[PDB]
Write a protein that binds this ligand. Structure first.
Ligand code: HEM
Length: 155
């Protein structure tokens, strides 16, 4: 739903490339996020002593956090918009425990697009980038609605 079937197919085609190395994609996305938007690192209490890129890549904790997150995103993308049951818990934790504003979900979406293009340019051209942006926009719109239902504006 929402995106066309062709758009979902582009999203899931590049996602299959992510699934060849979920850990490495997760590390690179977090490192890109922290470099581009340094305020985001303050949300990760156990990462503040990781001062260099190589320390971040060596951290098993960071790698596991990234795989957990990308696993949840991949499960959501595979629902092709039919994701209320998957978004509800994610909104509860990110609104009420981790305290993540919707803007930070924009920042990580930028980092996702950047890493996917860096690693898979032949499988992530303009049409696929547009499809993935629409899929992440839908994710962000729906999770922002769930934030409000819980009493959080996410601003
Ligand atoms: C695509 C967007 C995201 C997805 C799919 C995602 C998914 C997840 C999942 C599945 C977890 C583990 C369970 C939980 O506590 O909810 C998690 C934990 C966490 N997320 Fe996210 N997340 C996203 C974006 C973000 C962003 C942008 C930030 C901060 C800037 C963030 C901060 C955290 C933190 C601090 C934790 C706790 C990690 C731990 O202590 O192990 N998340 N995330």
């Amino acid at each position: 739903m929402v995106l066309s079937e062709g758009e979902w197919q582009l999203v899931l085609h590049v996602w299959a490339k992510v699934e060849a190395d979920v850990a490495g994609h997760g590390q690179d996305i977090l490192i890109r996020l922290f470099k581009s938007h340094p305020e985001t690192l303050e949300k990760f209490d156990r990462f503040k002593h990781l001062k260099t890129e190589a320390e971040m890549k060596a951290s098993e904790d960071l790698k596991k956090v990234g795989v957990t997150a990308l696993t949840a995103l991949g499960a959501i993308l595979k629902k092709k918009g039919h994701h209320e049951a998957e978004l509800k818990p994610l909104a509860q934790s990110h609104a009420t425990k981790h305290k993540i504003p919707i803007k930070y979900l924009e920042f990580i979406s930028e980092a996702i697009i950047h890493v996917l293009h860096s690693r898979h340019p032949g499988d992530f051209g303009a049409d696929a980038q547009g499809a993935m942006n629409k899929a992440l926009e839908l994710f962000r719109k729906d999770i922002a609605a769930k934030y409000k239902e819980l009493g959080y504006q996410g601003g």
